[PDB]
């Protein structure tokens, strides 16, 4: 029983990522919004607690600092004779990342908890929510017995769209770590098949509201840490991290490069 081996590390990171939200008849992709983000600025905190030898409990969380610009697409793939051609485009500079945040409590099972060399086996609940704003912007539609004719702009203030991801994600995985001199390299990867995602597209157009839920959805994420200990009480790290929901459905897929201070309490 260690009940003070506790600790506390800041971050600060980008987010980049890309949100596709899909229309289909009940199953064909008759529509794609493409949601696309970059370099949006993140703050990350985080606690552990070692109290056990083999076994450790840890809570993290991130959320945006504010919000970001971003660019959305609808394509629609109405052409029936050409099936992967595209029909009908819209295309949305004016889209904006609101916010996004995540929380994360998890336990860790130490197969080795070697002072030099770490391995466990990981499990946890993560909940992932991602929120989006665009309004106005081209249009690159086909007429009836045309193609790509119409070409214009909708008069901003009469077109306006909303668009939010929630992910509701029990996972299990594996967390790695190695410690060379002062410095310290280590991994992660987490999967999980049971993520209940849902998602809400409010097309306020002077509104209609397209939201779909899904069940068992899938969540793959892999992890890189390389840190180095500036006291033996403080260890500075960087970090990257590259995500993906999917099955297709409510999908998203972020890569949060992230750099933080560790004060070992």
Do not use: C
């Amino acid at each position: 029983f260690t009940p003070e081996k506790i600790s506390t590390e800041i971050d600060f990171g980008t987010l980049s990522g890309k949100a596709k939200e899909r229309v289909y008849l009940p199953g064909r992709k008759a529509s794609q919004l493409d949601w696309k983000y970059s370099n949006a600025p993140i703050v990350k905190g985080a606690f552990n607690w070692d109290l056990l030898p083999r076994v450790s409990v840890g809570a993290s969380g991130w959320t945006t600092l504010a919000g970001r610009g971003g660019n959305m697409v609808d394509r629609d793939w109405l052409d029936t004779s050409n099936p992967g051609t595209w029909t009908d485009e819209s295309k949305h500079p004016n889209t904006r990342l609101n916010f996004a945040n995540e929380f994360d409590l998890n336990i860790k099972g130490w197969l080795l908890n070697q002072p030099d060399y770490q391995l466990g086996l990981m499990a946890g609940y993560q909940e992932n929510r991602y929120s989006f704003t665009a309004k106005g912007g081209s249009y690159i539609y086909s007429s009836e017995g045309g193609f790509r004719d119409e070409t214009g702009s909708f008069p901003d203030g009469e077109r306006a769209i909303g668009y939010k991801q929630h992910f509701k994600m029990p996972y299990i995985g594996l967390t790695g770590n190695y410690r060379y001199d002062s410095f310290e390299f280590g991994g992660s990867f987490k999967y999980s098949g049971w993520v209940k995602a849902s998602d809400n597209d409010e097309h306020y157009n002077p509104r209609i509201t397209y939201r779909s839920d899904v069940n068992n959805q899938n969540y793959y994420s892999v992890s890189l840490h390389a840190g180095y200990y500036i006291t033996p009480a403080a260890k500075v790290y960087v970090e990257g991290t590259w995500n993906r929901i999917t099955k297709a459905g409510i999908e998203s897929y972020n890569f949060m490069t992230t750099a933080g201070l560790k004060y070992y309490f």
